Amino acid sequence: MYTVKPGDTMWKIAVKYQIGISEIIAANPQIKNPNLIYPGQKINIPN
Amino acid sequence: MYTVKPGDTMWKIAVKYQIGISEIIAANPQIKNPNLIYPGQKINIP
Amino acid sequence: MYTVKPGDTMWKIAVKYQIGISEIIAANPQIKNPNLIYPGQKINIP
Numbered sequence: 001m002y003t004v005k006p007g008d009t010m011w012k013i014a015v016k017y018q019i020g021i022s023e024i025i026a027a028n029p030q031i032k033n034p035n036l037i038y039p040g041q042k043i044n045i046p047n
Numbered sequence: 048m049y050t051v052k053p054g055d056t057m058w059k060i061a062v063k064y065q066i067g068i069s070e071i072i073a074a075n076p077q078i079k080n081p082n083l084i085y086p087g088q089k090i091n092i093p
Numbered sequence: 094m095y096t097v098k099p100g101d102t103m104w105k106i107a108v109k110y111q112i113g114i115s116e117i118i119a120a121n122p123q124i125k126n127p128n129l130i131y132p133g134q135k136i137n138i139p
């Protein structure tokens with residue numbers, strides 16, 4: 001549900017959606033490490 | 048067939064040369080982490 | 094309070110510590126250019 005933008009970190013995404021980082025991680029169990037994601041990939045955000 | 052220069056990122060090389068970001072990443076599976084590239088590295092242009 | 098590993102960038106260190114790039118930049122005003130950190134350099138992680 002969010003397309004990663006250049007420079008984004010998980011904290012920035014968490015700030016934008018006002019949700020904890022661990023909730024975003026739990027929505028994406030296929031991700032090996034968020035340090036491998038690149039801009040233009042889309043991650044799921046639980047509402 | 049592009050040599051990384053200081054200051055480059057994979058997104059900047061894709062935007063500057065008009066290559067899609069998923070295409071440049073898929074052309075370069077030898078880059079373990081697309082966020083970490085170094086000057087002098089050669090990357091493939093699809 | 095953290096030693097830069099070969100292969101670290103400020104963005105990778107921020108993502109490891111669950112913080113943002115501005116926060117790690119703010120903590121390190123001795124770093125002239127946040128894109129350029131060196132192996133073995135000591136930085137602050139707040």
Ligand SMILES: CC(=O)N[C@@H]1[C@@H](O)[C@H](O[C@@H]2O[C@H](CO)[C@@H](O[C@@H]3O[C@H](CO)[C@@H](O)[C@H](O)[C@H]3NC(C)=O)[C@H](O)[C@H]2NC(C)=O)[C@@H](CO)O[C@H]1O
Nearest residue numbers: 006007053054056057058082083084102103104128129130
């Ligand atoms: C896929 C994508 O574009 N990701 C973005 C990241 O690339 C970008 O981080 C910056 O990445 C470059 C390239 O890896 C880093 O430069 C490297 O930095 C190290 C440590 O200083 C240095 O040894 C390398 O020589 C140098 N390489 C080059 C080619 O100059 C740069 O430091 C990263 N910047 C930061 C602040 O961590 C991040 C952040 O802009 O965004 C991703 O979206």
